Amino acid sequence: MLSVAARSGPFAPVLSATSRGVAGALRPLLQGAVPAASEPPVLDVKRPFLCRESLSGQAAARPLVATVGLNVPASVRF
Amino acid sequence: SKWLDGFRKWYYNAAGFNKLGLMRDDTLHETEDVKEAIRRLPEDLYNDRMFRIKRALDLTMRHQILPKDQWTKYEEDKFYLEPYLKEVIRERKEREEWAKK
Amino acid sequence: QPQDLEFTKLPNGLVIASLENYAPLSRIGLFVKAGSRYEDSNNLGTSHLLRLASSLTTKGASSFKITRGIEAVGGKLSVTATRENMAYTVEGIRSDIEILMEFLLNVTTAPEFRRWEVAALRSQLKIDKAVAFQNSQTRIIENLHDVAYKNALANPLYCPDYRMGKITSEELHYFVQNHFTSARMALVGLGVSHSVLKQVAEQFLNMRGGLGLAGAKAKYRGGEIREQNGDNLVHAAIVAESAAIGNAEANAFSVLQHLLGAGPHIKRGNNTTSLLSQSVAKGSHQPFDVSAFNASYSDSGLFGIYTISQAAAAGEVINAAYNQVKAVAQGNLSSADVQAAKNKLKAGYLMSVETSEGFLSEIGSQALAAGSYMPPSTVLQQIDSVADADVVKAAKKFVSGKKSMAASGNLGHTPFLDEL
Amino acid sequence: ATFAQALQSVPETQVSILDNGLRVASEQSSHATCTVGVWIDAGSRYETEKNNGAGYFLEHLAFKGTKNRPGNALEKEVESIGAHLNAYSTREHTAYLIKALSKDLPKVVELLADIVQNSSLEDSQIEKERDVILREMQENDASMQNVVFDYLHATAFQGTPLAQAVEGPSENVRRLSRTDLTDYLNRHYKAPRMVLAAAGGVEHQQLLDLAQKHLSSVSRVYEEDAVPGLTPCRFTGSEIRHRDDALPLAHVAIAVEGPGWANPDNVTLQVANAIIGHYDCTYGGGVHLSSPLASVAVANKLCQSFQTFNISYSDTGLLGAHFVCDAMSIDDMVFFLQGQWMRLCTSATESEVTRGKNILRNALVSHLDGTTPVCEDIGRSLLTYGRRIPLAEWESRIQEVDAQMLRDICSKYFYDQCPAVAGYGPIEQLPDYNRIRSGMFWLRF
């Protein structure tokens, strides 16, 4: 009884991930399907930070505040 | 008047869209403002309208009509698309006036 | 009256503050205590949808009318939202401040919230959240509040991904009818007459109920979460409870924040006076950014250290910063450094006030918080009245307090809270 | 209490000249703080390709030690008085700025004079900041917009000192030495091309006395009469395309030759830029936006963002539009942008012209709200116009602007002109130069 299936009764298919690399002779129960998950929007790539002088100033020291506007860009201040 | 309601009911029966189960707001032509009104319709009204149009198309394919008791009548011909369509017309007239300015 | 600020309070609880400085640009702000604090688990993101729905069709002006009229004036309409409060700010020429105030109060007091409009706007909610989370500090601060509080401040300032597609116009109307009430708003103005301000106050804002729903007092919980996302730098915020807005303890905590380093004053500098940066740079050879995070609210505060470092050196940076704050709590400090911190705080507050946008924001925040004007001279007086013993007490309170940690990055060497 | 009365009530700045020709200007407000800065008329337009990163090196090394205060002592004094410190450099200008209180003005001006006069450049600090510049060049190469603007500047002002970027090439950064920095300091940091600008709770008499105390000896004379000179830089119609399809978005900037600083068409072209407008994907306007380009961008979902720029240099400028979009909307966005440009060029209406004028009023006053932008405006105005243009004069120019002369000036500057195009990213959809020119003339007008 040195195994997850022989110890956890209903938690065996939860603790054990089974992958059929080759399709079996018998059909499997609960085949499942991906219901067309959405894609996050494509945005501009934020710059990386490689030197400490340009790294300074980006550690937050104030409460988070958001700002939207009719004709001004939505900014966030830290 | 009392004469006007009876004449309107007779003309409504002569129109013939009640015999296929339609309503007036169903039978009005789908222009741009009408399309905006249907987009602004709630889900239940949109589903009932879509089923009514589909059943009407099936009936006209079969060259038949609904039975007499199942025809819609003048008193319960609800005008569901009327406020949405009126608001779309008002907004389009506002945009037209701003374009005129 | 350019010499002072005219200040009145209506019998329904509304606050009216005005200053006639004869500025070419006139500003009108409406400050409401209707932030993300006042949401329970059932209507999360309603504040975000309201903030993005501040340009919809209203009972008095359509969305097309609002947009075209405001951009024909050329003035600006904006919403600035915190956890505590929202601010609806309009600015424009003095000749068109009347119609700008009409648009502002039409979009605040009576929005229709048509369901097709919010159905089209929830995609804009998703896009705005993505743009806000383009940088990682927003995510770190949101996670920090979420693990610091049980309720009323753990609510995210941005709409959850599941709640996108679920926020209804009924929920928006419920939120507005329960929180957009007269006793919790303040209508402030720069370059406008107090008579005009009070006239439009009783012309629009007279028909709202009262105090409305209170809140949930924001109980503290502590704990930690760690988002491993494989980023090139590791962000880590370790905070604890502090005082609320309106306390000498909160003033001491702000002085302590500026003593440990609230950020750089010099572009591309070494930050030679900030004790956190000095202590980290004593034993590091990597890029880093360490600062004192401070965020007070109406009933609770958060004070701690924010560190951005490399993946391998994150533990060393966090330990050095924590040992520096531990030394401050033990009492390793000088009165000259405390005076320099107070001078930094005075300069920062005065530079916040010097801009008319910041001045309007401070006026509205003070009107919502205390219901009275505290002059900058008196603010600097109490800032100077902060003592260094209270700074040591605040540092000891942060050291001894229960910890909340939000970390993100590649955390193979980032320590845990029990290891600190 | 009208707009013109308020602009009359705006306080007037004061300008004075020292004995060495250094300009000293001040605007007094009721603010408790002050912004004191030094603007030097020097930059990449004066660099001659051998010291192409000298200004960037100097603004990195001016705060890392001086003769009187060595190493970090100036930083210690700045943090002790609580002042914010800043610097930047554009292709014509180099600015140092200090935001502080009104009671620390002598210390602020002494620190500014010591920075611009007695900057000690140690070789170890030179090497350290050289490594910093290499890392920062890598970071700015990773930044999408700066690459496109540098590409646009190069492909528009090629063969001239205006093509080279402010940071300079990495070869010149690595091979630049201390003697080149001393040559740049002794050649370009002259007295009469310096403006000491103060804005806020500052008295012009006290500022002039402090400038006489500190900035009197700047050595305006030249080493062997090696006086430089302003040379015109040609504008050319051209494009650069850095195709790299792995990047998510495409940045495209299209510009034409500008009017210059002293040209009175700047107000008209800024009004036209207000007509075209700007948009970001997070804008709350939606379909009902007054700008028709932004409206069609929302309606067709073309661009992530676009903006209109009018960058002006001595008798030249880059004037155009920069947009970030996906890889499948570049052609449509170029088409719509050129269509809006020539709608402005051919059929401009008084209603939209008044809308853009009011937008420009709001933009100028909102920019000039604040001590630091007032100081920046003072410095740039004295460096470019030779004087500070008052808000009443600006408003008079906007009153002079109407639809007919806007139409004439737009037809002068946009219509049938060869543009400069800078594209970066998946720009296969971006049209050819011939297609861009064919959009840059209409067959119906």
Curated annotation (Swiss-Prot), chain A:
Top-level taxon: Eukaryota
Assembly behavior: Component of the ubiquinol-cytochrome c oxidoreductase (cytochrome b-c1 complex, complex III, CIII). Subunit 9 corresponds to the mitochondrial targeting sequence (MTS) of Rieske protein UQCRFS1. It is retained after processing and incorporated inside complex III, where it remains bound to the complex and localizes between the 2 core subunits UQCRC1/QCR1 and UQCRC2/QCR2.
Function: Component of the ubiquinol-cytochrome c oxidoreductase (cytochrome b-c1 complex, complex III, CIII). UQCRFS1 undergoes proteolytic processing once it is incorporated in the complex III dimer. One of the fragments, called subunit 9, corresponds to its mitochondrial targeting sequence (MTS). The proteolytic processing is necessary for the correct insertion of UQCRFS1 in the complex III dimer, but the persistence of UQCRFS1-derived fragments may prevent newly imported UQCRFS1 to be processed and assembled into complex III and is detrimental for the complex III structure and function.
Official protein name in the record: Cytochrome b-c1 complex subunit 9
Location of this fragment in the whole protein: 1 to 78 of 274
Curated annotation (Swiss-Prot), chain C:
Tissue specificity of this protein: Expressed in neurons and astrocytes of the cerebral cortex and hippocampus (at protein level).
Positions of post-translational N6-acetyllysine modification: 33, 166, 217
Keywords on record: Acetylation, Electron transport, Membrane, Mitochondrion, Mitochondrion inner membrane, Phosphoprotein, Respiratory chain, Transit peptide, Transport
One of the protein's GO biological processes: mitochondrial electron transport, ubiquinol to cytochrome c
Post-translational changes noted in the entry: Acetylation of Lys-126 and Lys-217 is observed in liver mitochondria from fasted mice but not from fed mice.
Residues modified to Phosphoserine: 335
Membrane topology: Peripheral membrane protein
GO cellular component annotations of the record: mitochondrial inner membrane; mitochondrion; myelin sheath; nucleoplasm; respiratory chain complex III
Example GO molecular function: protein-containing complex binding
Subcellular location(s) of the protein: Mitochondrion inner membrane
Location (main, coarse): mitochondrion
Quaternary assembly: Component of the ubiquinol-cytochrome c oxidoreductase (cytochrome b-c1 complex, complex III, CIII), a multisubunit enzyme composed of 11 subunits. The complex is composed of 3 respiratory subunits cytochrome b, cytochrome c1 and Rieske protein UQCRFS1, 2 core protein subunits UQCRC1/QCR1 and UQCRC2/QCR2, and 6 low-molecular weight protein subunits UQCRH/QCR6, UQCRB/QCR7, UQCRQ/QCR8, UQCR10/QCR9, UQCR11/QCR10 and subunit 9, the cleavage product of Rieske protein UQCRFS1.
Assigned protein family: Belongs to the peptidase M16 family. UQCRC2/QCR2 subfamily.
Physiological role: Component of the ubiquinol-cytochrome c oxidoreductase, a multisubunit transmembrane complex that is part of the mitochondrial electron transport chain which drives oxidative phosphorylation.
Name of the molecule in the record: Cytochrome b-c1 complex subunit 2, mitochondrial
Lineage, broadest ranks: Eukaryota, Metazoa, Chordata, Craniata, Vertebrata
The encoding gene: Uqcrc2
UniProtKB/Swiss-Prot annotation, chain D:
Gene3D superfamilies per the UniProt record, alphabetical: Metalloenzyme, LuxS/M16 peptidase-like
Modified positions (Phosphoserine) in chain numbering: 177
GO CC annotations, alphabetized: mitochondrial inner membrane; mitochondrion; myelin sheath; respiratory chain complex III
Binding partners and assembly: Component of the ubiquinol-cytochrome c oxidoreductase (cytochrome b-c1 complex, complex III, CIII), a multisubunit enzyme composed of 11 subunits. The complex is composed of 3 respiratory subunits cytochrome b, cytochrome c1 and Rieske protein UQCRFS1, 2 core protein subunits UQCRC1/QCR1 and UQCRC2/QCR2, and 6 low-molecular weight protein subunits UQCRH/QCR6, UQCRB/QCR7, UQCRQ/QCR8, UQCR10/QCR9, UQCR11/QCR10 and subunit 9, the cleavage product of Rieske protein UQCRFS1.
Phenotype of gene-disrupted mutants: Results in early embryonic lethality.
Keyword Transit peptide: yes
Top-level taxon: Eukaryota
Family, similarity comment: Belongs to the peptidase M16 family. UQCRC1/QCR1 subfamily.
Molecular function terms, GO-annotated: metal ion binding; protein-containing complex binding; ubiquitin protein ligase binding
Cellular compartment(s): Mitochondrion inner membrane
Tissues where this protein is expressed: Expressed in neurons and astrocytes of the cerebral cortex and hippocampus (at protein level).
Modified-residue entries (Phosphothreonine), positions: 179
Membrane topology reported for the UniProt record: Peripheral membrane protein
SUPFAM superfamilies: LuxS/MPP-like metallohydrolase
Name of the protein in its database record: Cytochrome b-c1 complex subunit 1, mitochondrial
Function: Component of the ubiquinol-cytochrome c oxidoreductase, a multisubunit transmembrane complex that is part of the mitochondrial electron transport chain which drives oxidative phosphorylation.
BP GO annotations: cellular respiration; mitochondrial electron transport, ubiquinol to cytochrome c; mitochondrial respiratory chain complex III assembly; response to activity; response to alkaloid
Keywords: Acetylation, Electron transport, Membrane, Mitochondrion, Mitochondrion inner membrane, Phosphoprotein, Respiratory chain, Transit peptide, Transport
Residue positions where N6-acetyllysine is found in the record: 76, 103, 128, 213
Primary site of residence: mitochondrion
